Amino acid sequence: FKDLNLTDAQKQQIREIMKGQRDLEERRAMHDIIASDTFDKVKAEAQIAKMEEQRKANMLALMETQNKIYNILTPEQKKQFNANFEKR
Amino acid sequence: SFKDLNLTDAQKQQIREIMKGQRPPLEERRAMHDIIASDTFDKVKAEAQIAKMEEQRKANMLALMETQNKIYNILTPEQKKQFNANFEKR
Ligand SMILES: [Cl-]
Ligand SMILES: [Cl-]
Ligand SMILES: [Zn+2]
Ligand SMILES: [Zn+2]
Ligand SMILES: [Zn+2]
Ligand SMILES: [Zn+2]
Ligand SMILES: [Zn+2]
Ligand SMILES: [Zn+2]
Ligand SMILES: [Zn+2]
Ligand SMILES: [Zn+2]
Ligand SMILES: [Zn+2]
Ligand SMILES: [Zn+2]
Ligand SMILES: [Zn+2]
């Protein structure tokens, strides 16, 4: 989703980008927490803390990728990127 | 799937109860927007931003997990089996 009228050079600069940072026993542990007879808060706090590490890595990847995408855009395309960002 | 499990009247009430007993952060998004729309990627400020709502995320996730555990446990074994099998597929 990118209604920015992007140039051929741009699309392929973008592929280059979504390849460095285009580069699950988590959901198993949460499954075990939900499906247990009893709710173990301390065990759930530790799962949340471990999820924080992957969220960190994922958010850093997303944001770095998006920052590089932004900084190949024209002033006009940047304004449009920013407006689009306010709505999704 | 996920939410269509042939809940009985009683289960419908019991879920109603649970969900009162455990009930969009724009300021967070604004700060993501400042990091993305800058002429450089500032990792140290990005890490600060990401970490900022840790405690609120903890409370919300703990509430969510306790709520889901409580609803799992009012299910019959056939419904638990359905829910678990769907869970593996997500
Ligand atoms: Cl799982
Ligand atoms: Cl924003
Ligand atoms: Zn599972
Ligand atoms: Zn324990
Ligand atoms: Zn990098
Ligand atoms: Zn009825
Ligand atoms: Zn506010
Ligand atoms: Zn914004
Ligand atoms: Zn700002
Ligand atoms: Zn500068
Ligand atoms: Zn912390
Ligand atoms: Zn804490
Ligand atoms: Zn409680």
Residue numbers in the entry:
A (entry chain B): 29 to 51, 58 to 122
B (entry chain A): 28 to 50, 56 to 122
Reported in the publication:
Spy is one of a group of chaperones that allow clients to fold while remaining continuously bound to the surface of the chaperone. We have previously observed that the chaperone substrate Im7 exists in a heterogeneous, largely disordered crystallographic ensemble while bound to the chaperone Spy. To refine strategies for detecting anomalous scattering for observing partially occupied disordered states, we co-crystallized the tight-binding Spy H96L variant with short peptides derived from its client, Im7. These peptides each had a single iodophenylalanine substitution at position 18, 19 or 20.
The Im7 peptides L18pI-Phe and K20pI-Phe crystallized in complex with Spy show a very different pattern compared with the multiple signals observed for L19pI-Phe. The 5.2 keV phased anomalous difference Fourier maps of L18pI-Phe and L20pI-Phe each show only one distinct anomalous signal attributable to iodine. Consistent with the L19pI-Phe data collections, the strength of the iodine anomalous signal detected is highly dependent on the crystal quality. This combination of measurements confirmed that K20pI-Phe produced detectable anomalous scattering from a single position in the crystal, providing an ideal case for determining the position of a partially occupied anomalous scatterer. Anomalous site refinements show that the occupancies of L18pI-Phe and K20pI-Phe are approximately 20% and 33%, with B factors of approximately 47 and 55 Å2, respectively. In the case of K20pI-Phe, a simultaneous fitting of the new L19pI-Phe and K20pI-Phe signals within 0.43 Å on average was possible.
